Design an enzyme around this catalytic site. Sequence first.
Site, PDB file in Angstrom:
ATOM      1  CB  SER A  45      -0.977   0.071   1.149  1.00  0.00           C
ATOM      2  OG  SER A  45      -1.055  -1.152   1.853  1.00  0.00           O
ATOM      3  CE  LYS A  48      -3.947   0.977  -1.341  1.00  0.00           C
ATOM      4  NZ  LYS A  48      -4.972   0.548  -0.371  1.00  0.00           N
ATOM      5  CB  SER A 105      -5.004   1.265   3.785  1.00  0.00           C
ATOM      6  OG  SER A 105      -4.070   0.796   2.777  1.00  0.00           O
ATOM      7  CD  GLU A 141      -4.015  -2.887  -3.035  1.00  0.00           C
ATOM      8  OE1 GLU A 141      -4.076  -4.061  -2.580  1.00  0.00           O
ATOM      9  OE2 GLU A 141      -3.190  -2.027  -2.640  1.00  0.00           O
ATOM     10  CE  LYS A 209      -1.263   3.614   2.548  1.00  0.00           C
ATOM     11  NZ  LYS A 209      -2.400   3.268   3.442  1.00  0.00           N
ATOM     12  CB  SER A 210       1.802   1.576   7.303  1.00  0.00           C
ATOM     13  OG  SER A 210       0.434   1.213   7.224  1.00  0.00           O
ATOM     14  N   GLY A 211       2.511  -0.229   4.916  1.00  0.00           N
ATOM     15  CA  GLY A 211       2.363  -1.319   3.934  1.00  0.00           C
ATOM     16  C   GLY A 211       2.490  -2.680   4.590  1.00  0.00           C
ATOM     17  CB  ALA A 212       0.740  -5.348   5.713  1.00  0.00           C
TER      18      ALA A 212
HETATM   19  C1  LIG Z   1      -0.817  -1.802   2.969  1.00  0.00           C
HETATM   20  O1  LIG Z   1      -0.622  -2.758   2.220  1.00  0.00           O
HETATM   21  C2  LIG Z   1      -1.608  -1.766   4.104  1.00  0.00           C
HETATM   22  C3  LIG Z   1      -1.812  -0.636   4.812  1.00  0.00           C
HETATM   23  N1  LIG Z   1      -2.624  -0.606   5.895  1.00  0.00           N
HETATM   24  C4  LIG Z   1      -2.743  -1.580   6.975  1.00  0.00           C
HETATM   25  C5  LIG Z   1      -1.409  -1.835   7.703  1.00  0.00           C
HETATM   26  O2  LIG Z   1      -0.485  -1.027   7.540  1.00  0.00           O
HETATM   27  O3  LIG Z   1      -1.342  -2.863   8.388  1.00  0.00           O
HETATM   28  C6  LIG Z   1      -3.849  -1.200   7.992  1.00  0.00           C
HETATM   29  C7  LIG Z   1      -3.867  -2.187   9.168  1.00  0.00           C
HETATM   30  C8  LIG Z   1      -5.231  -1.322   7.290  1.00  0.00           C
HETATM   31  N2  LIG Z   1      -5.591  -2.656   6.837  1.00  0.00           N
HETATM   32  C9  LIG Z   1      -6.259  -3.635   7.499  1.00  0.00           C
HETATM   33  C10 LIG Z   1      -6.392  -4.633   6.601  1.00  0.00           C
HETATM   34  N3  LIG Z   1      -5.823  -4.265   5.429  1.00  0.00           N
HETATM   35  N4  LIG Z   1      -5.340  -3.040   5.563  1.00  0.00           N
HETATM   36  S1  LIG Z   1      -3.796   0.522   8.693  1.00  0.00           S
HETATM   37  O4  LIG Z   1      -4.213   0.386  10.068  1.00  0.00           O
HETATM   38  O5  LIG Z   1      -2.466   1.046   8.517  1.00  0.00           O
END
Ligand SMILES: *C(=O)/C=C/N[C@@H](C(=O)O)[C@](C)(Cn1ccnn1)[SH](=O)=O
Length: 263
Positions: A45, A48, A105, A141, A209-212
Amino acid sequence: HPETLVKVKDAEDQLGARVGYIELDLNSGKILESFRPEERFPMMSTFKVLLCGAVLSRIDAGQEQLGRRIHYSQNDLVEYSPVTEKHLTDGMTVRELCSAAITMSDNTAANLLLTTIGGPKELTAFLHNMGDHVTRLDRWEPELNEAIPNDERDTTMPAAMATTLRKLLTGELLTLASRQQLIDWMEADKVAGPLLRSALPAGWFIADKSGAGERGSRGIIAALGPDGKPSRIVVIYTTGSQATMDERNRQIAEIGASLIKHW
Ligand SMILES: *C(=O)/C=C/N[C@@H](C(=O)O)[C@](C)(Cn1ccnn1)[SH](=O)=O
């Protein structure tokens, strides 16, 4: 600082995976600290922010409007669409979709915005045209998060992502109003931040901006500094770990704590 490098390497040991790291000075662009700066990682993410940068570039050129309302259907909705799933009948503005993509996200929101610019290959052409010959989006996505080892699809390098983020937030690439809007979306309140925001004291500015992704993929891009202003870019990526989400969060948080302590 050398002690932050020691913690990045300790994070590798704890996760049993590679960690990419870079600190830029926001004003000068000079590299202050790096580890695996030119190795590739899944963006997840974190793309984005680049997407909404491309959208604002078109608003600046008279090819898009923040206020344009977009209608979509049930069949556009993908997994994790907490905002877009609530607006089937009334639709959403470009403004609202960028807020939902970056702040909440929302995955459907990112797909709708990719459709506005002509898909992943047009985000790659935007990046190529402003001098980032490395970062590339190839898929939508949710399958851009697959993180197959040695697969260069949907990847950046820490050094490339950091240079690009700096050019979007402070260049002449976007107008003053669009720069402000992008950093504003990144700064907005989220329900939970277990990454750099957990290690960040009161009075500090953070826009992030975070990513998983799959295969223990985790990351974050950030503009942050003391005295309520940003003064550095920080990019952290990891892929390959079999460790819990809690364990990956804790390692990135501890890199943040070290970055702040030795500012
Ligand atoms: C990127 O790939 C994801 C970003 N958002 C996530 C995360 O950083 O873990 C969260 C948890 C939103 N989320 C839940 C399920 N899928 N995305 S947000 O809290 O940063």
